């Protein structure tokens, strides 16, 4: 199979005067790549995929497959949603823009059946011929992709290669491996990055990794390399950095984050979402002061 | 304010060889109509509102409206969206087509905040003039709309004017109505219509009045006169059929019954919803068969 | 048509004095209760802190409730659940030999058995005694839930089980119990929830409120019972914010907080792993009292 | 710090004509031994202890004392209590009578608080001058010790050194090991037990150990040796029993599974607890055909 594996970063999406931010979304992405950064997730969860227009989905993968090309790092881009159609549209115009593979979270609030889910993804899968990771986060989407349908998702269709598991259940992980060592299981999920990729994980799909790439980048390579010791004294360094990003929904801790670094000159959101509270400002503000945030 | 209160349908959207059967959908609409339903919800989850293109939208509201001119049914389109910009443009855009009010869930995945739950929903009711029904239905979309969130939307925006609760918490709905008695609460877990009702809520939005729109007429109808016994003994009667409605998500398994009574002439869903498990389809069927349907 | 124990019920709190049970003002706050209405009470229940009762404090706090009610239209429904089951049978054979009107038992609690289980733990409970049962599921503290399924067929097959006090806070098991045996007693077993429980065909509450506020549950669940609901409902809304607050911590912490604040426990004492709460929620609680009235003695 | 880790063994408790079969426990604690089991578990929550009397809560400990005798294997007594002052006194007998430390469960039903929760353990830990391991299992108790508290109590007590976790949450013990690196964290679920060790936990406390004893045993310590390609290889051998042995509540499954292996002669509970249903325990027996069961 094609894989898309290592350590990855789900893009944050910079706004400025309520608009795309596009050379602060090139340097971004370049600060990734200087970083060890094997692979960037553009306009997902943590990008306000939910709050683009249609032609800033579009734009905002086509920087990023230009400011990859010349790199090792691939551009996995967000392709994911609640109707089959669109999914398929999202997932051949990713294709057809240059990207290496596609995310497709599980479609949300509809809550499909495990059967749904099946054809859901085999259609997308279907249709594009590149490779596809699944994304399971049912605090967000309202419903579970099953280990037995991912599973036969794996081993039906040629394009789906693993999972971003995004569960907070590393029961789920073990399932997973046991039944199906073969499949790329990716973290999604910052705070256990180290137990996801002990238990034979490939790889991270990270938010601190906007902040501290590095950190991440070693963290996973370490592990990948079977150097535990050194991979989990990074994953414990990182915890309360990792766990202060979700004080309050993502991505608006790390976004916060961000423009406390001086990485973004503004910290606007779309509505529905907004800027934390100021406890929780301070909150962020002061789990910063201990960590190193490099710069451009 | 204005307000659009008592038995009301949420209607299912039926589909002939994958495009919107609409004369049907006209014929579905009088006989609720006719069996005495106040009003009506075009679109929304139970019309799988996340499958449809933008144009059955419009179709289906005018459809809808048109329907009901000449009746005092009313029409409370479903206009609701993750993006608060889009979701302003749904309420400019159902205002546009004569709907008497809009129903707006809360925002689904993106998981905002309380502050930014209050924007998003003082951003629709300030930039269109109809009646607006919150709709909070955690299990679908990752969040809850705070009692102390609505009650402030109530008490500050006109326009909205209740909320439809579909958490499966009688104790919240105690709450908003023992602190704002003014809130029209209405239910939206048919096994709970009664106690709802009998605690001060206004109406239901419905899945069971597809089916069984007499029975469900009666139930709000006798609760407002506070005749408690008669809406009891009917919520207990539909109690069987209130939860074998979603041995499935909704509305997998009121379509398979609309198909079964011969009330919709096939039996189609848009990806990912699909048709319903084997034993489920039997559950459906064996229970729908305690019950009296009336038919056109 | 078996014999029942309903109405208005209070699960009265055990007052401490020097790690002892202040078996005085154990008796006085009884009395309050039966001036104020009260058609029930629940001695060594877990607002009583069973848990860490001795078993001797265990009966002495029966035998005082029997015998100040006696005179009274007041019934005794004593505590007497169990994880064991040979244990509830003798605390159930136990309670009747003290005098007792009826028991509450609880579902068994850690060790989480079937449904299977639960059947044969309450059929040998209530065929040991013949006296009336009435079961308690709370799975918040418990990790197991009674099944409708469960309740009903006890209720068919055991003439000593009469109802269940729900604590489940999902009036949707409510409405199933009731819909498909509509001769049982639910009890309701959460306070800002009463109303809509007694709306529903509910028979009774037992409360932890009515420590505090006799008058206003004893009201509230006889207007509710005499088909009065706009009154009814009137009082469980005025009693929603005393109602949450006494949960702002695990029960019984704020109701034995309220109780010290109003001067009706002249201590306030907890047996370990218990203690007072929080400063932040003893002013709550404290701040919330001050807008309702309260009986003295 | 004196501590207890290891490969452990949560003892289940053979009953005969409604007895305790003593002849029959002082062998299973024998067969344990001889399969490299570093420590035994008696009468705490797979034995069966709310249903036992003091009485045969000592005489299980005083055999378990006897068979351990002269061996590597140490004796963690059960002595866990939801009311402060019993547990206290169970604490202060299971010192008495010489098992080498104690499991001692968080107060269940009445729900304490953190506050309450640390006065607790305090009062335990300063009655006996033996090592205490905390024991974490919100699912049967209740409630859950913080990671903020067990820390507190781990830094005041000399006597308390680490925690079992039975909360399924990896994250906690990420929290706990990233804070605090010296306690002894010991896994109390046993799907997940190989992901707890290779985060840094230091045993498993375990009940298939009970039917396969040196497999658990071998996982254990590959884990500590940190041959982690082999401990996850037995894991994930592990994973269809380990969950089969929870298809209805602990200890019903492996009462069952040690039955049908001919390791204990008759298949009895205290109500209550009973047998399970014809269908899980055709499910357990079809497992327990994949894999190889030690005799004595
Ligand atoms: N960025 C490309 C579109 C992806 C779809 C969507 N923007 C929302 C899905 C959507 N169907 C979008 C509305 C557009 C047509 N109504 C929805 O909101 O339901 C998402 O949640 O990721
Ligand atoms: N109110 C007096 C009754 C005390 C009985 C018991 N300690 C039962 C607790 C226990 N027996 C465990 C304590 C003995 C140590 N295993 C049980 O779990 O059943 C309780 O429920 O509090
Ligand atoms: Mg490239
Ligand atoms: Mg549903
Ligand atoms: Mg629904
Ligand atoms: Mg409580
Ligand atoms: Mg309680
Ligand atoms: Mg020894
Ligand atoms: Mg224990
Ligand atoms: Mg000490
Ligand atoms: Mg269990």
Same mark, same amino acid.
């Given at each position: 199979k094609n894989?898309?594996?290592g350590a990855m970063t789900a893009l944050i999406t910079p706004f400025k005067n309520g608009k795309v931010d596009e050379q602060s979304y090139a340097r971004l992405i370049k600060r990734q790549i200087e970083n060890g950064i094997d692979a960037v997730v553009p306009v997902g969860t943590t990008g306000e995929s939910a709050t683009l227009t249609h032609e800033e989905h579009r734009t905002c993968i086509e920087i990023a497959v230009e400011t990859c090309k010349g790199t090792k790092v691939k551009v996995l881009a967000g392709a994911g949603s609640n109707a089959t159609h669109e999914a398929v549209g999202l997932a051949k115009f990713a294709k057809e823009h240059g990207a290496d593979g596609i995310l497709?979270?599980?479609?949300?609030? &509809?809550?499909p059946t495990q059967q749904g889910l099946y054809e859901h993804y085999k259609a997308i899968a279907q249709?594009?011929?590149?490779?596809?990771?699944?994304? &399971?986060? !049912?605090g967000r989407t309202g419903c579970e992709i099953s280990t037995d349908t991912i599973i036969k998702l794996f081993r039906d269709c040629e394009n789906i290669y693993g999972v971003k598991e995004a569960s907070g259940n590393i029961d789920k992980c073990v399932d997973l491996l046991a039944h199906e060592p073969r499949m790329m299981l990716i973290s999604g999920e910052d705070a256990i990055n180290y137990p996801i990729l002990s238990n034979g994980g490939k790889g991270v799909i990270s938010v601190t990794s906007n902040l501290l790439p590095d950190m991440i980048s070693a963290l996973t390579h370490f592990a990948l390399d079977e150097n535990y010791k050194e991979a989990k004294k990074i994953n414990?360094?990182?915890? %309360?950095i990792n766990k202060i990003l979700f004080?309050?929904? %993502?991505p608006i801790p790390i976004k916060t984050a961000m423009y406390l670094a001086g990485l973004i000159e503004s910290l606007?959101?779309?509505? !529905?979402?907004?800027?934390?509270?100021?406890? %929780?400002?301070?909150?962020?503000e002061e789990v910063m002061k201990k960590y190193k945030i490099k710069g451009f």
């Amino acid at each position: 199979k094609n894989i898309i594996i290592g350590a990855m970063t789900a893009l944050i999406t910079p706004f400025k005067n309520g608009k795309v931010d596009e050379q602060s979304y090139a340097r971004l992405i370049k600060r990734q790549i200087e970083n060890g950064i094997d692979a960037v997730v553009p306009v997902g969860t943590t990008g306000e995929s939910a709050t683009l227009t249609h032609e800033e989905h579009r734009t905002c993968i086509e920087i990023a497959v230009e400011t990859c090309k010349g790199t090792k790092v691939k551009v996995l881009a967000g392709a994911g949603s609640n109707a089959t159609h669109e999914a398929v549209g999202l997932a051949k115009f990713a294709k057809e823009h240059g990207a290496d593979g596609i995310l497709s979270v599980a479609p949300f609030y &509809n809550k499909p059946t495990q059967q749904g889910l099946y054809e859901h993804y085999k259609a997308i899968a279907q249709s594009v011929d590149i490779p596809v990771l699944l994304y &399971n986060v !049912p605090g967000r989407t309202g419903c579970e992709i099953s280990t037995d349908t991912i599973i036969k998702l794996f081993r039906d269709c040629e394009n789906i290669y693993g999972v971003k598991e995004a569960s907070g259940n590393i029961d789920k992980c073990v399932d997973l491996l046991a039944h199906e060592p073969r499949m790329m299981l990716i973290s999604g999920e910052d705070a256990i990055n180290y137990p996801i990729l002990s238990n034979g994980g490939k790889g991270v799909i990270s938010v601190t990794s906007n902040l501290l790439p590095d950190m991440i980048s070693a963290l996973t390579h370490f592990a990948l390399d079977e150097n535990y010791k050194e991979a989990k004294k990074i994953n414990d360094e990182l915890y %309360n950095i990792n766990k202060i990003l979700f004080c309050e929904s %993502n991505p608006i801790p790390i976004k916060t984050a961000m423009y406390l670094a001086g990485l973004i000159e503004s910290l606007e959101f779309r509505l !529905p979402l907004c800027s934390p509270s100021k406890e %929780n400002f301070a909150k962020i503000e002061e789990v910063m002061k201990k960590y190193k945030i490099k710069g451009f």
